[PDB]
Amino acid sequence: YLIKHKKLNDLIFRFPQQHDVLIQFFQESAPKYGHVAWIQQILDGSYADAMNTLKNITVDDSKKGESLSECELHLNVAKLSSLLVEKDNLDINTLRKIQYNLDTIDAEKNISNKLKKGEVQICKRFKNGSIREVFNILVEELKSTTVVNLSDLVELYSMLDDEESLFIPLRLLSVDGNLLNFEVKKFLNALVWRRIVLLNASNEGDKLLQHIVKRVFDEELPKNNDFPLPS
Amino acid sequence: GFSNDDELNGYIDMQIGYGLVNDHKKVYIWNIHSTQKDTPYITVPFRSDDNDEIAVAPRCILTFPATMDESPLALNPNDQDETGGLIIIKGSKAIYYEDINSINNLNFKLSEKFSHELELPINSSGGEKCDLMLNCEPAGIVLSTNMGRIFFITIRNSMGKPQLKLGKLLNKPFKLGIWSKIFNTNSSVVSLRNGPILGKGTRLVYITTNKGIFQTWQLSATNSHPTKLIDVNIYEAILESLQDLYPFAHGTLKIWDSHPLQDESSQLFLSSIYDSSCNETYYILSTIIFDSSSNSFTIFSTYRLNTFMESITDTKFKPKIFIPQMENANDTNEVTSILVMFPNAVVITQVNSKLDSSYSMRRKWEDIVSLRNDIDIIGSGYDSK
Amino acid sequence: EEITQYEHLIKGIREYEEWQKSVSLLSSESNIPTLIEKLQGFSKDTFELIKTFLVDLTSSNFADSADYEILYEIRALYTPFLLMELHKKLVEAAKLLKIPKFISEALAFTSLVANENDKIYLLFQSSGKLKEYLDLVARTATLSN
């Protein structure tokens, strides 16, 4: 009631003995009082309620997306508000995520444009990749000036892989991959290795073998342990 | 009448016909092959969506169109519709910007789709920073680092459509003890000069380092190991040869630039000799012919500029020779005119081809066009005569 | 250049003092437009002076040498002091005049604090004033209640 009726002084200080229930209230997805609600929550040293609120903000096309100028502004304000997390509520991890988020949209868009211009490459299997027979279809529908088709963008994004993004799978399995199970990690790592040793043997010029091996030493992949070299 | 940074990196791109000077906050791009003296000024602000790592200073260089019809020539009456793609190096990220005219000032999320990013190798023993960029398309971009690492980036994949894929390091980091550039092929690149367009997706690229190592790299767009045609140190040879006609060329030798002649196997080397009986510097034009057909070399002629005995070291960059390669008709290719570019004179000469002993190897025609000290070379390109 | 840098705190205080008088003329004890005119003069002055000081410092080669630190310390003093001073005003205006723009103007100084101009939001944290400043903004809204 209070959060709606702009009675914020009464909420914290006049009823000091229902506090424990008030932690339940914070755990709400949004308290109800609109987009002015979340602001109040950053202000009180009651940040935990607001992080959860802001999620509902970013899917509303009427709170961001009124116009271009206002949209860019809103994104700035959310970021700045994140900076004002103290130690009251340990939303420091969320703070980092809000910052990360413009870089995330760029990664998304980046890869999307490539796929639109036939960024996805032909499958190695045979003369042409079967995936493309699917990839082309998804590009065209979205190339037509018509309504945004959410499903089409999701499918399109992952299916055909940037060669600018092959390094991250190798990095990830070294650092994090013993958690997935050795046997999983070994399998994926072995897949890439196969292809690498399937070219040096074809001809006579190796130098292929060391580049992948010596390459993992630069970022200390062996030091991460259990990471084999091309073999 | 723009804001000026302390650092100004220019390159004139005659492969596309657009002119560039860049700041390290913005790039200013204009149609320099226009038929009117006046030109529009495309200003492109730097992104904060983009990612950037280590100390690498922003060099910006133009690249072929990719959303607009391709320019394999300098082109356009004054259209800004055909201004190519853009590559800006921020850190370890080479970022290629597609469109640059549909950039709105109240949205920046349409800029995102035009940004493609690539991570270039990290771990260096003598550091990194983009020093020179030479558009040597058709093939791609070769960029030099001050340490002496040399990176080839193909801007197209194999579908002939845009994608950055790192081709190969021409020069790799030497992690051999002690030296990092001190006793290797890596040292400070002093020239990145285009060599002839032999077609077939190949471009000769001449690489001359400060030590006096001459490297000829036959680049081709697709290559996981480019072939080096020439690899000889010529510093010793020059010093020796200048004792047969000049008896005061004893001591002090600097190699300043290398640039191709009309003949592609023949390279002109810019040198200085110091006369210690008068404190004069005679700039010596040396025609050196390279055999890439045996990886051998011979010095053909050494010519001393006889009326030009000034010591003139350039205000911006080090002394450069220019001999613009042929691209248009021009009657007679047996004599070579050489432009020696300094910010206070242009010595125009022509050097021996006669092997006269009845007129010596110098004392031919020499003319000087004196300039003022307000020439500050930001970048240079050539094509035609 | 020294005179310019030192003057910035002082000019804002001079306007501040004129405003302390104006404070006693709030609550419709002078016509409302004259009080808002004075108020606009004062708000903009203080903010402007912060901005000016930042620019001067950064591009005089004092952010390009290791003498910087004495200046940073000077900035530390100026920024939270002026910002606070300005922020505690407008709260007073909001109750006395009963106009929500001043609820907005109080709230608006929170965005300046979070902007990086030598990381103003760290100074406030460090000093322990960030919560104090935050709670005041909330209470401005409670004035319409």
CB neighbours (10 Å) of residue A104?
Answer: 11
Q: Which helix (H) or strand (E) segment is B260 a member of?
A: strand B253-260
Residues of B in contact with A108 (CB under 8 A): 112
- CB burial readout B101-132, b (16+ within 10 A) else e: eebeeeebbebbbbbbbbbbeeeeebebebbb
Residues of C in contact with A80 (CB under 8 A): 111, 114-115
* Nearest alpha-carbon partner for B96 in B64, B55, B130: B64
With CA atoms as reference, the chain A residue closest to B165 would be A164
Q: Are C131 and C85 in contact (CB under 8 A)?
A: no
* Nearest alpha-carbon partner for B303 in B262, B335, B265: B335
Q: Are A64 and A72 in contact (CB under 8 A)?
A: no
Does B200 reach chain A within 8 Å, measured CB to CB? no
Among A8, A81, A83, select the one facing C141 at the smallest CB separation: A8
Q: Which helix (H) or strand (E) segment is B287 a member of?
A: strand B280-291
Q: Are B337 and B221 in contact (CB under 8 A)?
A: no
* Nearest alpha-carbon partner for B301 in B272, B274, B253, B268: B268
Which residues 6-45 of B are in CB contact (within 8 Å) with A? none
* Nearest alpha-carbon partner for B82 in B34, B134, B16: B16
Does C143 reach chain A within 8 Å, measured CB to CB? no
- CB burial readout A186-217, b (16+ within 10 A) else e: beebeeebeebbeebeeeeeeebbeebbeebe
DSSP secondary structure of B152-221: EEEEE-SSSSEEEEEEEEEE----SSS-SSSSSS-S-EEEEEE----SSSEEEEEEEETTSEEEEEEEES
Q: How many CA atoms lie within 13 A of B40 on its CB side?
A: 12
Q: How many CA atoms lie within 13 A of C3 on its CB side?
A: 0
CB pairs under 8 A between A and C: 42
Task: Please tell me the distance from the alpha carbon of residue B37 to that of residue B233, in angstroms, as a whole number.
Answer: 44
Does A103 reach chain B within 8 Å, measured CB to CB? yes
Among C115, C125, C131, select the one facing A45 at the smallest CB separation: C131
* Nearest alpha-carbon partner for B144 in B175, B190, B97: B190
Side chain identity, residue B129: K
Task: Please tell me the distance from the alpha carbon of residue C36 to that of residue A131, in angstroms, as a whole number.
Answer: 67
Q: How many CA atoms lie within 13 A of C14 on its CB side?
A: 7
Task: Please tell me the distance from the alpha carbon of residue B94 to that of residue B85, in angstroms, as a whole number.
Answer: 13
Among A106, A164, A207, select the one facing B118 at the smallest CB separation: A164
Does C142 reach chain A within 8 Å, measured CB to CB? yes
Give the distance from residue C138's alpha carbon to the nearest chain A alpha carbon, in angstroms. 6
Task: Please tell me the distance from the alpha carbon of residue B27 to that of residue A41, in angstroms, as a whole number.
Answer: 43
Q: Which helix (H) or strand (E) segment is B328 a member of?
A: none
Task: Please tell me the distance from the alpha carbon of residue A173 to that of residue A160, in angstroms, as a whole number.
Answer: 20
- Sort strands B150-156 and B162-171 into parallel, antiparallel or unpaired: antiparallel
Task: Please tell me the distance from the alpha carbon of residue C49 to that of residue C60, in angstroms, as a whole number.
Answer: 17
**DSSP classification of residue C84:** H
Cβ–Cβ gap B107/A113 under 8 Å: no
Among B49, B106, B225, select the one facing A106 at the smallest CB separation: B49
Q: Are A105 and B109 in contact (CB under 8 A)?
A: yes
Residues of B in contact with A167 (CB under 8 A): 119
Task: Tell me if residue A179 falls in helix, strand or coil.
Answer: coil
What sign for the dihedral angle of Cα B16, B18, B19, B22? negative
Cβ–Cβ gap C145/A7 under 8 Å: yes
> From residue A43, how far is each of A48, A80, B234 by CA, in Å?
11, 13, 72
* Nearest alpha-carbon partner for B12 in B133, B122, B148: B133
Give the distance from residue B294's alpha carbon to the nearest chain A alpha carbon, in angstroms. 23
Task: Please tell me the distance from the alpha carbon of residue A87 to that of residue B328, in angstroms, as a whole number.
Answer: 72
Q: Are A110 and B117 in contact (CB under 8 A)?
A: yes
Does A1 reach chain C within 8 Å, measured CB to CB? no
Q: After which residues is chain B broken (C to N over 2.5 A)?
A: none
Return the structure tokens found at B95.
């970022």
Chain C touches chain B, with at least 3 Cβ pairs below 8 Å, answer no
Task: Please tell me the distance from the alpha carbon of residue A94 to that of residue C106, in angstroms, as a whole number.
Answer: 27
Task: Please tell me the distance from the alpha carbon of residue C49 to that of residue C106, in angstroms, as a whole number.
Answer: 18
Does B227 reach chain A within 8 Å, measured CB to CB? no
Return the structure tokens found at B361.
């190897």
Does C138 reach chain A within 8 Å, measured CB to CB? yes
With CA atoms as reference, the chain A residue closest to C141 would be A6
Q: Are B170 and B231 in contact (CB under 8 A)?
A: no
Task: Please tell me the distance from the alpha carbon of residue C99 to that of residue A211, in angstroms, as a whole number.
Answer: 70
Task: Please tell me the distance from the alpha carbon of residue A79 to that of residue C114, in angstroms, as a whole number.
Answer: 9
Q: What is the largest CA-CA distance in chain B?
A: 74
Does B165 reach chain A within 8 Å, measured CB to CB? yes
Helices of type H across B235-292 = 235-241
Task: Please tell me the distance from the alpha carbon of residue B263 to that of residue B228, in angstroms, as a whole number.
Answer: 19
- Sort strands B202-209 and B213-220 into parallel, antiparallel or unpaired: antiparallel
Does A214 reach chain C within 8 Å, measured CB to CB? no
Does A44 reach chain C within 8 Å, measured CB to CB? yes
CB neighbours (10 Å) of residue A10?
Answer: 14
Q: How far apart are the first and last CA of chain A?
A: 67
Write B42-48 long-range contacts (CB < 8 A, 24+). B42/B80, B42/B83, B42/B100, B42/B101, B43/B2, B44/B86, B44/B97, B44/B100, B44/B103, B45/B103, B46/B88, B46/B90, B47/B95, B47/B108, B47/B111, B47/B115, B48/A102, B48/B108
Among A8, A42, A80, select the one facing C142 at the smallest CB separation: A8
Chain A: partners with 3+ C-beta pairs within 8 Å: B, C
Tell me whether the omega of the peptide bond preceding residue B77 falls within 30 degrees of 0, making it cis: no
CB neighbours (10 Å) of residue B12?
Answer: 20
CA C62 to chain centre: 24
Task: Please tell me the distance from the alpha carbon of residue A31 to that of residue A50, in angstroms, as a whole number.
Answer: 9
Give the distance from residue A220's alpha carbon to the nearest chain B alpha carbon, in angstroms. 11
CA angle C34, C38, C44 (to 5 degrees): 145
What sign for the dihedral angle of Cα B210, B211, B216, B222? negative
Place of tokens 């404070």: C23
Q: Are C50 and C99 in contact (CB under 8 A)?
A: no
Task: Please tell me the distance from the alpha carbon of residue C46 to that of residue C79, in angstroms, as a whole number.
Answer: 10
CA A212 to chain centre: 27
> From residue B373, how far is each of A13, A175, A188, B21, C115 by CA, in Å?
75, 58, 64, 20, 45
Q: What is the dihedral of CA A51, A57, A58, A64, to 10 degrees?
A: -140
Among C114, C138, C144, select the one facing A40 at the smallest CB separation: C138
**DSSP classification of residue A120:** S
Residues with Cβ within 8 Å of residue C105, at least 6 apart in sequence = C43, C90, C93
Cβ–Cβ gap B108/A122 under 8 Å: no
Residues with Cβ within 8 Å of residue B29, at least 6 apart in sequence = B18, B19, B20, B41, B42, B44, B62, B83, B86, B100
Cβ–Cβ gap A106/B118 under 8 Å: no
Task: Please tell me the distance from the alpha carbon of residue B262 to that of residue C110, in angstroms, as a whole number.
Answer: 67
> From residue B276, how far is each of B236, B247, B284, B318 by CA, in Å?
20, 11, 16, 22
Residues with Cβ within 8 Å of residue B339, at least 6 apart in sequence = B321, B322, B323, B346, B347, B348
Cβ–Cβ gap A9/C141 under 8 Å: no
- Sort strands B337-341 and B227-233 into parallel, antiparallel or unpaired: unpaired
CB neighbours (10 Å) of residue B233?
Answer: 11
Q: In angstroms, what is the resolution?
A: 8.1
Does A65 reach chain B within 8 Å, measured CB to CB? no
- Order across the sheet with B18-22: list the strands: B9-13, B18-22, B26-31, B42-45
- Order across the sheet with B253-260: list the strands: B253-260, B266-275, B280-291, B296-304
* Nearest alpha-carbon partner for B138 in B184, B197, B66: B197
* Nearest alpha-carbon partner for B226 in B311, B97, B336, B139: B139
Q: Are C129 and C113 in contact (CB under 8 A)?
A: no
Cβ–Cβ gap C115/A80 under 8 Å: yes
With CA atoms as reference, the chain A residue closest to C108 would be A77
DSSP bridge pairs for C54: none
Does B160 reach chain A within 8 Å, measured CB to CB? no
CB neighbours (10 Å) of residue B214?
Answer: 22
> From residue B253, how far is each of A4, B235, B240, B275, B351 by CA, in Å?
83, 8, 11, 11, 20
Q: How many CA atoms lie within 13 A of B338 on its CB side?
A: 25
* Nearest alpha-carbon partner for B255 in B289, B286, B297, B300: B286
* Nearest alpha-carbon partner for C141 in A43, A15, A29: A43
Task: Please tell me the distance from the alpha carbon of residue C88 to that of residue C41, in angstroms, as a whole number.
Answer: 16
Cβ–Cβ gap A83/C114 under 8 Å: yes
CA angle A168, A173, A179 (to 5 degrees): 140
Residues with Cβ within 8 Å of residue B113, at least 6 apart in sequence = A109, A110, A112, A113, B98
Place of tokens 């350039």: B314
Phi then psi dihedrals of residue B348, to 5 deg: -120, 130
* Nearest alpha-carbon partner for B336 in B283, B282, B385, B272: B385
> From residue A38, how far is each of A4, A15, A33, A45, C133 by CA, in Å?
12, 21, 8, 12, 18
Task: Please tell me the distance from the alpha carbon of residue B184 to that of residue B188, in angstroms, as a whole number.
Answer: 11
DSSP secondary structure of B79-146: -SSS--EEEEEETTEEEEE--SSS--SS--SSSTTSEEEEE-----SS---EEEEEE--SS-EEEEES
Burial class for B172, CB neighbours closer than 10 Å (0-12, 13-18, 19+): middle
Cβ–Cβ gap C135/A44 under 8 Å: yes
Residues of C in contact with A8 (CB under 8 A): 138-139, 141-142
Give the distance from residue B301's alpha carbon to the nearest chain A alpha carbon, in angstroms. 41
Residues of A in contact with B161 (CB under 8 A): 117-119
* Nearest alpha-carbon partner for B185 in B199, B169, B201, B196: B169
Task: Tell me if residue B232 falls in helix, strand or coil.
Answer: strand
* Nearest alpha-carbon partner for B308 in B223, B372, B369: B369
